[PDB]
Amino acid sequence: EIVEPEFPHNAIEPCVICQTRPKNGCIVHGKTGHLMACFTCAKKLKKRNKPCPVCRQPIQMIVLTYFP
Amino acid sequence: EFPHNAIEPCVICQTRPKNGCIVHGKTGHLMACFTCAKKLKKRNKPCPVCRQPIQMIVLTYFP
Ligand SMILES: [Cl-]
Ligand SMILES: [Zn+2]
Ligand SMILES: [Zn+2]
Ligand SMILES: [Zn+2]
Ligand SMILES: [Zn+2]
């Protein structure tokens, strides 16, 4: 029963799809977003009309996310 | 270069995790918590980092 912690300890782990690139492709649906994939992989999900893998909501857009 | 900055606390309040992504155009700057970022959007203040107008706040999760 893995509940995510308060702070995003896994933010530095690689994209869960390609397993090499940083998590910078935020999958946005409504006012929430799941950030577990890189921009390239997340764009491919939307291009191929696939839903967000985590919550299964339709993907409205991918936001290229920076962490300044 | 992986986002180690993402694990630091909200730049504005220093006590909450960075889950308020500030969207502008097709990009987002994630450095503030949702509460602080929403206060900025409600007051039509710009992104703290790049000072561009805020399109929306995305409540962000790291699953
Ligand atoms: Cl300001
Ligand atoms: Zn990827
Ligand atoms: Zn989702
Ligand atoms: Zn804050
Ligand atoms: Zn910005």
Task: Give the DSSP per-residue string, A15-51.
Answer: -TTTSSS-S-EEEEETTEEE--S-HHHHHHHHHTTPP
Encoded tokens for B16: 């909450």
Q: Report the domain count for chain B.
A: 1
B28, A66 contact by CB (below 8 A): yes
Distance between CA B14 and CA B4 in Å, rounded? 16
CB of B22 closer than 8 Å to CB of B14: no
CATH number of the domain within which B54 lies: 3.30.40.10
Q: How far apart are CA A51 and CA B15, in angstroms?
A: 33
In angstroms, this model's resolution equals: 1.2
Q: How many CB pairs under 8 A join A and B?
A: 96
d(CA B6, CA A57): 24
- Considering only the beta carbons, identify the residue of B6, B17, B58 that sits closest to A33: B58
Which residue in this structure is represented by tokens 């299964």? A56
CA–CA separation, A6 and A25 (whole Å): 21
Domain of A47 in residue numbering reads as: 1-68
Tell me whether residues B28 and A23 touch, CB distance under 8 A: no
Cross-strand bridge partners of residue A62: A27
Out of A4, A13, A28, name the one closest to residue B58 (CB).
A28
The tokens describing B44, both together, are 């039509």
Q: Could you say which ligand is closest to the alpha carbon of residue A27? A: 3
Query: Cβ(B7)–Cβ(A12) under 8 Å?
Result: yes
The three-state secondary structure class of A64 is strand
Q: Counting Cβ atoms within 10 Å, is residue A57 exposed (0-12), middle (13-18) or buried (19+)?
A: middle
Please state, as a whole number, how many other Cβ atoms lie within 10 Å of the Cβ of residue A1.
2
